[PDB]
Design a protein around this ligand. Structure first.
Ligand code: HEM
Ligand code: HEM
Ligand SMILES: CCc1cc(CNC)cc(OCc2ccc3ccc(N)nc3c2)c1
Ligand SMILES: CCc1cc(CNC)cc(OCc2ccc3ccc(N)nc3c2)c1
Ligand SMILES: C[C@H](O)[C@H](O)[C@H]1CNc2nc(N)[nH]c(=O)c2N1
Ligand SMILES: C[C@H](O)[C@H](O)[C@H]1CNc2nc(N)[nH]c(=O)c2N1
Ligand SMILES: [Zn+2]
Lengths: 411, 407
């Protein structure tokens, strides 16, 4: 079957055949679309088809399909499964899998970069201290003094689900959130619950607006352990505005390295429950969502108040006006400090080029419009006018429930 | 099967049971989501009529009444006999209001029950359509105090005698493909502005020329009519701060009046059913003014603001976009013409969603269309999970007449 997408700004039409290789489900049916829904122990019965499919893909990509090398590997993986009820990926396979998980991440606008991922194999890791060391090296490598580099560090796969490796942090670097008795919040409200856990686990909280959280690391299903990232490794950027001198005095800064650490990497049926990865920021992640979401730092009012905007009626668009300057300031600051960042205009433009290239060479590019379109200035970016097909390919990054909701405490 | 939707800004969770009464298809499957795709006989008819009459008589607290059964058999007889049927006025009004209530892409549905329905089913000629439409326009505009309205022309019979309004909106500005290669007026209407001239219009080849109506009655060739200028309320666009803004020479019309959709009620098809409400500011300022394939004035406005247009990372496009949308709102409000900003409208819709979940068991909503084209995540609807499904009565899309007209 053929599927056509259209760009209503340029009238370019692309044809999707890749969706036929789609395994997983969307959540949608013929009778309901769950396109805007945010979130819509494995036996051997189902493992070998998943392994075979991955290896068929792998050996196609290296143009060795049906080769003796291909067949032996299948045989090898096969025996290893029914002998051990799992199997191990070769280094080459792991690298391929991680890159393609990224390539398949339909909610990621940054995928033009997917082929240049630095994969750190941490499958020989056994303890939380080992995890901390690997993560430090990831952060140092990825940060690269502000010239950021995409990286992923992959810890050992799940076995019985009773020995999981997990990073309890949602990102490697994030600021603490503290709920005050008067109901207000100090720091990042998104992180209040995790902060509390850390504090409970023995973390001594500086209780400021921008405390970098400690890593909380779980190895081999053991109780997690606290570690402080060395501050010299945490690159941060003070936020100032190129024309507004009072903006510096708002006291804002942000960290340079976005490193998501709570997702699950699936490759050939194998589940890597700890696989922190990092790229670099799109400006709006910080300027729009982190600073201006009502449920986050929520600085729109103070900025608008300092701009002397008409804040009495919404139709003045004072919120809209302050939002733009804040995002200007975030971009200005990162660029002035020579820290890699991309504006939403450049990023969406690159993604369209990527997507078109993917249709030509791959026969498709699964893409989640709801997530690809930036949280401000939607229709003046080219992805707004781009029709997209969303479907799920493997290898993939998957959501997993927060570890504190499922962890069996040892003590 | 009983679905939950979460607001991630407020943690509020609503349970949706209404989707289980869905009939039409979404375009989606379990394998692929098409959520961002713009455009996905006698025996067919009676279940369709029955389903509608069921929800109608249920709605008036008379489900399973004698009148219900009587109406059912009455309609069933008329179908068996005439191969179609006619709606009672009360049912027509209900169906129209509920078509609007069911429009999953419409952010303005908190107003759905306050709709003025104009029964134009006795119309027989294009001249009659023109008269009905002028009356619609005058009533809806109401000297700037806009009132929602729909005018419903005769239903389809055998597709040979369709009533169609060839305009996409009752009021739109002309677009001309210039010799030097550019485009004067509205580029979205270049083909229609051509067809108008191609059937005898005389364009004042200006920038904001209100297009003539091209009305098709009973399957006949369509006819040109000019809306009396005094019926077309326009708003000169100035900025409350930049006095050079007015020099740009921009204005827009007060009445957004979509006229190319198909209204389906109880299996009956109304191919000519122009309806109107009032603008959300971003429709004009974000889409009509700044879309690349439209008036695309961003670069011009950015210039006069003397913004750094060297690199995209200065967000000059963004900065300009906000000021433009400030001006639109400011102009309309000054001139006492109804308009809603995207903050209040999206706030209205959340409250409306709340209401619909609470009294109806849900509210079909297309997130891709409900979220405004600017400042998305600082409006409440961005953080609102929505379920999209298709309820009847409905507004549907139909081919442009000039691709189908048995000429
Ligand atoms: C290199 C520059 C990159 C940029 C500019 C970028 C940009 C983005 C943005 C803006 C989002 C939406 C995030 C949000 O709004 O919360 C996203 C999502 C995502 N990205 Fe990328 N990204 C980059 C690199 C990467 C890398 C290296 C990976 C993995 C190896 C990755 C995988 C993903 C995944 C799995 C999501 C979806 C998160 C979810 O499902 O909720 N990205 N990206
Ligand atoms: C009264 C104030 C109203 C407001 C503020 C409003 C707002 C909107 C907006 C902003 C859109 C997005 C369309 C676009 O971006 O092109 C829309 C779509 C739509 N509106 Fe409403 N609207 C109003 C009244 C009405 C009325 C009176 C009707 C019908 C009787 C209606 C039916 C629809 C339909 C059917 C669509 C989407 C068409 C489709 O399926 O693609 N609206 N509306
Ligand atoms: C719902 C799961 C989730 C939530 C959130 C925060 N929402 C409040 C963020 C999530 O992932 C967000 C993400 C993932 C990968 C990225 C890679 C690079 C980059 N610059 N940003 C990313 C951002 C996933
Ligand atoms: C695809 C269906 C569609 C397309 C387009 C043009 N987009 C290229 C416009 C459509 O309708 C757009 C519409 C409909 C009803 C409205 C009622 C009030 C209002 N203020 N705006 C409306 C705007 C529907
Ligand atoms: C391709 C994409 O679906 C298309 O650009 C849509 C996106 N969302 C929209 N939303 C509204 N309200 N109006 C539109 O015309 C569109 N266009
Ligand atoms: C309910 C809705 O799906 C949710 O708010 C989504 C919308 N689109 C998004 N898009 C991005 N990039 N990031 C997000 O967190 C979200 N949140
Ligand atoms: Zn869908």
């Amino acid at each position: 079957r053929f599927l056509k997408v259209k760009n209503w700004e340029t009238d370019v039409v692309l044809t999707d055949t890749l969706h036929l290789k789609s395994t997983l489900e969307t959540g949608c049916t013929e009778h309901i679309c769950m396109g805007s829904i945010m979130l819509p122990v494995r036996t051997k019965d189902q493992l070998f088809p998943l392994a075979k499919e991955f290896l068929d893909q792998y050996y196609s990509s290296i143009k060795r399909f049906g080769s003796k090398a291909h067949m032996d590997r299948l045989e090898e993986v096969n025996k290893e499964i029914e002998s051990t009820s799992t199997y191990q990926l070769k280094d080459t396979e792991l690298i391929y899998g991680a890159k393609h998980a990224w390539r398949n991440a339909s909610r990621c606008v940054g995928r033009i970069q997917w082929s240049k991922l630095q994969v750190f194999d941490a499958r020989d890791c056994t303890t939380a201290h080992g995890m901390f060391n690997y993560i430090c090296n990831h952060v140092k490598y990825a940060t690269n003094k502000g010239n950021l580099r995409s990286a992923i560090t992959i810890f050992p796969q799940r076995t019985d689900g009773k020995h999981d490796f997990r990073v309890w942090n949602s990102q490697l670097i994030r600021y603490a959130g503290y709920k005050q008795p008067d109901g207000s919040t100090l720091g990042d409200p998104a992180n209040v619950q995790f902060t509390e856990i850390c504090i409970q686990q023995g973390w001594k909280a500086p209780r400021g607006r921008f405390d970098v959280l400690p890593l909380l690391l779980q190895a081999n299903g053991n109780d997690p352990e606290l570690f402080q990232i060395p501050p010299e490794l945490v690159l941060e950027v003070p936020i100032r505005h190129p024309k507004f001198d009072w903006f510096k005095d708002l006291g804002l800064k942000w960290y340079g390295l976005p490193a998501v650490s709570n997702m699950l990497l699936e490759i050939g049926g194998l589940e890597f429950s700890a696989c922190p990865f990092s790229g670099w920021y799109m400006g709006t992640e910080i300027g729009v969502r982190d600073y201006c979401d009502n449920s986050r730092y929520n600085i729109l009012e103070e900025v608008a108040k300092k701009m002397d905007l008409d804040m009495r009626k919404t139709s003045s668009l004072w919120k809209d006006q302050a939002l733009v300057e804040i995002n200007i300031a975030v971009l200005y600051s990162f660029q002035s400090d020579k820290v890699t960042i991309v504006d939403h205009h450049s990023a969406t433009e690159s993604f369209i080029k990527h997507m078109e290239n993917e249709y030509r060479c791959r026969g498709g590019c699964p893409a989640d419009w709801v997530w690809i379109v930036p949280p401000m200035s939607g229709s003046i970016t080219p992805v707004f006018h781009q029709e997209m097909l969303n479907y799920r390919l493997t290898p993939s990054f998957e959501y997993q429930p927060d570890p504190w909701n499922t962890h069996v405490w040892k003590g």
